[PDB]
Amino acid sequence: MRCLALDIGGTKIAAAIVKNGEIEQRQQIHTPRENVVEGMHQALGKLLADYEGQFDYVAVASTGIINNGILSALNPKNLGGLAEFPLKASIAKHTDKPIGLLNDAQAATYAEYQLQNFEQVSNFVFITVSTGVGGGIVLNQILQTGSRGIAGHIGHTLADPNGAICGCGRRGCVEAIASGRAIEAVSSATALVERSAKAIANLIADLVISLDIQKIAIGGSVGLAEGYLSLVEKYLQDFPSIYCCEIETAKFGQDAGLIGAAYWVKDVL
């Protein structure tokens, strides 16, 4: 049908009309860095004005833990210090069409999985390495969300018990070491990108041995970066082969959240 898709990230908000699977009227605005609550409300109202009368429903792919129309920030530092935002309510102010909501990496995992050889890939993870580090887990071709929408927050699993404190409050999260935010927090060389890639290869090994994942797609601004995937591949062959699996770049690229949310909201009516 006709979908209004939002992809709220810590750095960018995207928006588009997914119609019969195709992205039409793409926009991309900065995510507010200050006055964030006021800013999120103005941005959502603007974006909903722009697409007035062209959608049957609203699908939202949002960074953070999404449960009961509420965005809870595991890492408030991705959302400009914001802890929580009444995401569905704020959107319902502007339309009475249905509104469905999903974590941003869960939505992207749904998108990329649709492109899988469904019978020979039943356990699949998509990893975003962008502003933060996010993930989604499909197991027996079912997307995990959890009772609370937490499933997939693989960026806040342990990369190093002696590493930086993460913005979530935990020490040594993968996101605290590998993410875009973590990379440019130190640069203010090549060796920086390697530390990020090695941490992501450890996370891949972890998900393989823990969940018997058969395939992993990598996305996000850092993940899709020319040369990154090959660096993660190089670190994966230090492991015993049992930890290896095939890694490919996300094929929807930066649109995977839009299409995933659009198709996910539809496909669980």
Ligand X SMILES: CC(=O)N[C@H]1[C@@H](O)[C@H](O)[C@@H](CO)O[C@@H]1O
Q: How far is the CB of 103 from ligand X (least distance, A)?
A: 5
* Window 46-85: contact mask with ligand X (x via CB under 6 A): -----------------xx--------xxx--xx------
242 assigned to a ligand binding site: no
Q: How far is the CB of 201 from a second copy (least distance, A)?
A: 10
CB atoms within 10 A of CB 14: 21
**Cα–Cα distance for residue pair 192/196, rounded to 1 Å:** 7
* Window 144-173: contact mask with Zn ion (x via CB under 5 A): ------------x---------x-x-x--x
* Window 156-175: contact mask with ligand X (x via CB under 6 A): -------------------x
Got the DSSP string for 125-194? EEEEESSSEEEEEEETTEE---SSS-TT-GGGSBS-TTSPBPTTS-BSBHHHHHSHHHHHTT---HHHHH
Q: How far is the CB of 202 from a second copy (least distance, A)?
A: 5
Task: Please report where in the chains the tokens 């995401």 appear, as a residue.
Answer: 87
* Burial class for 9, CB neighbours closer than 10 Å (0-12, 13-18, 19+): buried
Contact residues toward a second copy (CB under 8 A) are 74, 122-123, 137, 139, 144-154, 156-162, 168-170, 198-199, 202-203, 205-206, 208-212, 214, 239-240, 242-243
Region for residue 202 given its phi and psi (left: phi exceeds 0; alpha: psi -120 to 50; beta: otherwise): alpha
9 assigned to a ligand binding site: yes
269 assigned to a ligand binding site: no
- Binding-site residues, in ranges, read 5-12, 132-139, 156, 166, 168, 173
